């Protein structure tokens, strides 16, 4: 509908897969070469189906901060003959609050699915499913199951990745640019 809108469809065209786990289906954000990430409770193990193909993992990673306190993503390398663009750039290098949020999730429940959640608060701890969490952002809108891994986006900027909700605020996890460095 406008320029916000207009950067999270680039980046879902072509920076997102559909990762299936034991647990469930997500949006997996991939970020440079064969190296995606994905919601830590998704459990990745030694084979991921991207797109519905069997997929070896070369490495996975669930990242934690130096307190030793969860953050929620974990860092895959997949075993494909393809790469992704590059979108190390449209990181941000601090943790921060930002305007007019774009939560973008394609699954095969919600495909091409696009929601403007807004202004996006960092919210720092969180419990979350009973662990404890930081570098949280939050938005007030009433996310729902399904919607875990989607992208979050502001005009130039790759934020988060969505990981929970409440009923009435949903809840992403930071991408910071030295995740990836
Ligand atoms: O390839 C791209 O840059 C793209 C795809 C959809 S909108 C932008």
Redesign the pocket.
């Given at each position: 509908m406008g320029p916000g809108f207009?950067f999270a469809?680039?980046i879902?065209?072509?920076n997102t897969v559909i990762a299936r786990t034991e647990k469930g289906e997500f949006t997996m954000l991939g970020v440079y070469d064969r190296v995606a990430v994905i919601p830590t409770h998704a459990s990745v193990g030694e084979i991921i189906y991207i797109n519905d193909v069997e997929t070896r993992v070369l490495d996975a990673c669930a990242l934690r901060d130096l307190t030793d306190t969860n953050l929620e993503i974990t860092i895959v390398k997949l075993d494909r003959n393809q790469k992704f663009?590059d979108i190390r750039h449209f990181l941000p290098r601090c943790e921060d609050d930002y305007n007019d949020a774009v939560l973008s999730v394609h699954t095969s429940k919600f495909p091409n699915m696009y929601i403007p959640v807004g202004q996006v608060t960092n919210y720092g701890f969180l419990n979350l499913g009973g662990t404890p969490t930081h570098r949280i952002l939050m938005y007030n809108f009433p996310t729902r199951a399904g919607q875990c891994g989607g992208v979050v986006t502001t005009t130039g900027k790759v934020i988060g990745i969505h990981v929970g909700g409440n009923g009435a605020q949903g809840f992403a996890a930071m991408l910071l640019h030295s995740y990836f460095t």
């Amino acid at each position: 509908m406008g320029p916000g809108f207009d950067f999270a469809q680039a980046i879902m065209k072509k920076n997102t897969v559909i990762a299936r786990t034991e647990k469930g289906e997500f949006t997996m954000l991939g970020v440079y070469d064969r190296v995606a990430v994905i919601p830590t409770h998704a459990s990745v193990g030694e084979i991921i189906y991207i797109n519905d193909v069997e997929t070896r993992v070369l490495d996975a990673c669930a990242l934690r901060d130096l307190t030793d306190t969860n953050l929620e993503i974990t860092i895959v390398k997949l075993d494909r003959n393809q790469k992704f663009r590059d979108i190390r750039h449209f990181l941000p290098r601090c943790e921060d609050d930002y305007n007019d949020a774009v939560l973008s999730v394609h699954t095969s429940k919600f495909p091409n699915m696009y929601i403007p959640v807004g202004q996006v608060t960092n919210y720092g701890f969180l419990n979350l499913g009973g662990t404890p969490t930081h570098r949280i952002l939050m938005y007030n809108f009433p996310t729902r199951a399904g919607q875990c891994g989607g992208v979050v986006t502001t005009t130039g900027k790759v934020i988060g990745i969505h990981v929970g909700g409440n009923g009435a605020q949903g809840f992403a996890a930071m991408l910071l640019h030295s995740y990836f460095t």
